[PDB]
């Protein structure tokens, strides 16, 4: 969660 990176709207990471 504290690692995630949101590129943009709708795409989510980690």
């Amino acid at each position, epitope marked *: 969660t504290r*690692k995630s*990176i949101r590129i943009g709207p709708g795409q989510a990471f980690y």
Partner: antibody
Amino acid sequence: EVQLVESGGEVKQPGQSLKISCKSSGYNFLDSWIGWVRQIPGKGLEWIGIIYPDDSDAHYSPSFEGQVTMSVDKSISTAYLQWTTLQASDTGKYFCTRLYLFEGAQSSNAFDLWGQGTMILVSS
Amino acid sequence: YLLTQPPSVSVSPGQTASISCSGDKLDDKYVSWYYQRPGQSPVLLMYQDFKRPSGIPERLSGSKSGKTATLTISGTQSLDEGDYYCQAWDASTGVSGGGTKLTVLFGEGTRLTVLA
């Protein structure tokens, strides 16, 4: 305070190795990703790579993968980029930064914190 | 892709400068804007298309239509002269797999001249 503090400016020779330091403080060093951007001054900004100090998952820019290496050392909360072998292109002002998780409603990310920059002059 | 920006921009004092940023994916990628004075370090101005980070004045505003994102500064002043960079990302799972590849692209920047 919240600040990244970086090693001083070096004048290196082509083919010399190199390793620069970015010490971090004011937050949890492992929970926020660390960044490395270059300033080829007069020219643009040039992103190099990210690493997560907790596990060291990285993402190298496809232009430094192979010529540059990013590491972290947690006990001294310090992030490192290093060359095995320099070259005149490797010249420039190296900034390390901190990637912030803006836990907004719909979340996003960005670089709110920046080291003073280490200046590297590669020449003979 | 890549982020494109006007190498330079001019606004007369007290007036509105617009700085654009064009990318082939920006139709669907959060843009962020940075400040830099010669010699000094980059400053976050804007993130997630429009979100001003704290301490950054309401006179600066951020928008993005299509594959184009715009930094707008009203009430311009000598204190605004410097360079401004749009940034964004890019991912891509490998077709062979092996995870998801992340990339941070920056525009080349816009020297803002305030015609004092």
